Amino acid sequence: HGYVSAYENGVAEGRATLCRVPANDTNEKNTNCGGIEYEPQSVEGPDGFPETGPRDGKIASAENSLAAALDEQTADRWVKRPIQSGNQHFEWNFTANHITKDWKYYITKADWNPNQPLARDSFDLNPFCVVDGGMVKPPMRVSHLCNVPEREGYQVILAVWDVGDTAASFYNVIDVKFDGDSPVLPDWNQGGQIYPSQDLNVGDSVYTRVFGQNGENVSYSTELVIDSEELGAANNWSHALATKINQEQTMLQAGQLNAEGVISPIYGTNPIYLKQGSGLKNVEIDYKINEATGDIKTEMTVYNHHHESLSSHSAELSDGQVEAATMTLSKSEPGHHMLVVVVKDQQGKVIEQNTLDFHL
Amino acid sequence: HGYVSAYENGVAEGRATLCRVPANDTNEKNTNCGGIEYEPQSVEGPDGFPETGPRDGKIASAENSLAAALDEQTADRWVKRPIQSGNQHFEWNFTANHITKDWKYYITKADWNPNQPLARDSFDLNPFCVVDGGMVKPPMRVSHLCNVPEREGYQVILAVWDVGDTAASFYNVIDVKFDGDSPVLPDWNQGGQIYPSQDLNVGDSVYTRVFGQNGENVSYSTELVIDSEELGAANNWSHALATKINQEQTMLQAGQLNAEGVISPIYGTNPIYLKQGSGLKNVEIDYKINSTAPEYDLEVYGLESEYIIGDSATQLDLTLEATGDIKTEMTVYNHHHESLSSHSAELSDGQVEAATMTLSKSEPGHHMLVVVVKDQQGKVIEQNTLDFHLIEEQTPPPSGEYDFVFPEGLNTYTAGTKVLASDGAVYQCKEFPFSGYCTQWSPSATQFEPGKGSHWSEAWNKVN
């Protein structure tokens, strides 16, 4: 179990790695990754790639259901990481350093379609880099010297850790950005990001707080009212707020440097750029939010004098329904005891924790 | 905006910080933080603590909705970072280095209650550290040397950043563990974690993969079968699994180090411990998805092969056939892979809904419709990309002996464009590369005008 990292000399994290671990130098993370975000070391599948192994369109998850979210392939779904051709260093970090057979690295074809599911046809199946593992265990971290071919723009690198003591390999796609040194929009610099941070209800709004020389300045503020249920989808209001900022402001722009270079709102995470020489430093996002009391997703736990768990009972009650609860202790011991009571809502967020006391 | 960090000398990351950034050494993270996991720099609330400010129970969230989850307070809810008495470096990391009034640090009372919401009464309200900010901008990352009071066990430090140029303060509570010398289970080590990674269905199972001297060894494996709606909750099966692991194994135990150094299953993350000299060095988690899954599918009708660029933005008039309970996402891209339209549609089984997508740009060439399909719980099931084109408006067949009465249509003149001139004769727009002169005309710059301009001889030629 391991993953592609960049803690030492690694020139770019892997897609799954980024679902959990911010990037080296930009703090960026990938979004809505499913369970794999808890366990980026678990992208494990049948070996024998490319002749066999993970079927087309399941290369990025290695057919592990845990990582199914990774199999989506579009021009703007994924955090991309910059790279140059020639000799680069790729890094693996292991939580379990299995006897290793070899590591292999493939890069997408130069003219691949970033909006098709990743498939054998997407890749130059003659790997650009192969490292002998020699049927020994590796250290708990290694790096590799690979001759990254010449590409332009968005490309994917597939890193295949083929372990020796199992019939599985670890597959980490890497989302890279081949920028040929010539800086794109050098009078624009990133200053903040619109993460798809949560869904909003109708009557909420979301707005910018633009921080410059005289702290925040509301002349630069942009606000988007949420007036349909569809716009309340995180990825919908993110895109609409980016679009609105671009329309209403001129000293800052929102979106990704697309294939056209010039900033364009995407339907995921929209970075915010700041015109250089404009004095702006940073942009944040803020939000205006406009027994069975209401609709509640509830929880409960029993504790004692020594602050220890005994029992648990959820109950995502309806409105007004006064339901009965049987909880039993897993240690009916005497003395100081506590009963926590969590009153969330039917969307998760915490409203009220009320602790009682009792003695057995 | 900023947060308590440990990218350098920092002794400990703040609770919210750990919702997004894995801990300095252990690579640990808090779980189920809600929206704040995307923006830990934003735990912002009314200033004036403790006389006024964020009310009791809302201290750790600073009353900010985005960070409501933080207000939960139990003995085992949060990652606890280790700390010593005496001088320590507390480190803030800023995204907006605001003019600063002061920083203050409060520690909980030595005998506070970790199962009561955090409250003024939980703290020594005489701050154990104060740093006068001087009403100047800090650098983007700073550290304060603070004389941490002597304590023992689970303690919460509240780091209050009081901002100079607003009515707000950033509140970052910090969960710490005072264990100095006095080794806690030195014959036991952490080797992995049961993170509550996902909900599971009935028929699924979840099991361990223990890695030691000879690779993985299934004699230590424990498997939990999800046989109940309740056990499918990510917190529940994490607890039940750690409990089963402890029943059946002896060289490894799962759960948080409690108050008595006893490894005990909790209801969030359950760490996994490995007995000294047993050989075991790492435990992972794995899942069998043997819950029966409906044969999901989506079908998109109404996509044309070609769409003629009209006056208004091009529109897709599609309808969707949904098999299984699904959530859909569709995105239109153009042949240079820029995004122009999207349609989220949380459908249900057999439902047939109308989609109408509008291209932010109606320009000619090859376009793709990306159709992404997930189930009621948002697991990606399949992606299909359908192709279509945009064609320019087909110019009608020619007729008569010219194309425009000059200057009409001036913008479109190209090699072969015949026009009727004011003198009554017909001229044609010269070929490459004179053809660009034909587009150059104005009532002030009247050259290149057929039969009138000083230099029409270049751009145009008379027809016979």
Curated annotation (Swiss-Prot), chain B:
This is GlcNAc-binding protein A. SUPFAM superfamilies: E set domains. The gene is gbpA. Keywords: Chitin-binding, Secreted, Signal. Belongs to the GbpA family. Pfam families: GbpA_2 (PF18416), GbpA_D3 (PF21868), LPMO_10 (PF03067). One of its GO terms (molecular function) is chitin binding. CDD domains: LPMO_AA10. It comes from the Bacteria. Probably interacts with GlcNAc residues. May promote attachment to both epithelial cell surfaces and chitin. Gene3D superfamilies: 2.60.40.2550, 3.30.70.2150, chitin-binding protein cbp21. Residues 7-178 form the Chitin-binding type-4 domain. GO terms for cellular component: extracellular region. Residues 415-456 form the Chitin-binding type-3 domain. It is found in: Secreted. HAMAP family: GbpA.
